[PDB]
Design a protein around this ligand. Sequence first.
Ligand SMILES: [Cl-]
Ligand SMILES: [Cl-]
Ligand SMILES: [Cl-]
Ligand SMILES: [Cl-]
Ligand SMILES: [Cl-]
Ligand SMILES: [Cl-]
Ligand SMILES: [Cl-]
Ligand code: NA
Length: 129
Amino acid sequence: KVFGRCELAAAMKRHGLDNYRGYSLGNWVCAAKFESNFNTQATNRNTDGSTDYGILQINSRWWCNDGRTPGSRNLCNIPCSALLSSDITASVNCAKKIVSDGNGMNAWVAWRNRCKGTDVQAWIRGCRL
Ligand SMILES: [Cl-]
Ligand SMILES: [Cl-]
Ligand SMILES: [Cl-]
Ligand SMILES: [Cl-]
Ligand SMILES: [Cl-]
Ligand SMILES: [Cl-]
Ligand SMILES: [Cl-]
Ligand code: NA
């Protein structure tokens, strides 16, 4: 599924991400824009053989099981395929564990490089939330 901007903001609020760990909804929408372009089915292979999955590009090195990332963990206790669903529940639940892990949203390098410090409220501007 490819979300629209306000459609995703709404879905993220419905699943409890707005102001989770103090990160406003525009932070989460901005991270999703630059990680996946709002596409739930996005996959990207990393140099090290891990893969990033879904709207928030969650990495198989730590968070999900894809059966092909040697020496990796599955701390969200989910198959990485669950992170590709039209329903963002699995991605949100897992993202809550990642953002609680100690470095906040810096875990998302695209959020650090493209969203952190910017006017992230623009991402929810005009949305009926
Ligand atoms: Cl957009
Ligand atoms: Cl915001
Ligand atoms: Cl594996
Ligand atoms: Cl594990
Ligand atoms: Cl699995
Ligand atoms: Cl959803
Ligand atoms: Cl923080
Ligand atoms: Na893994």
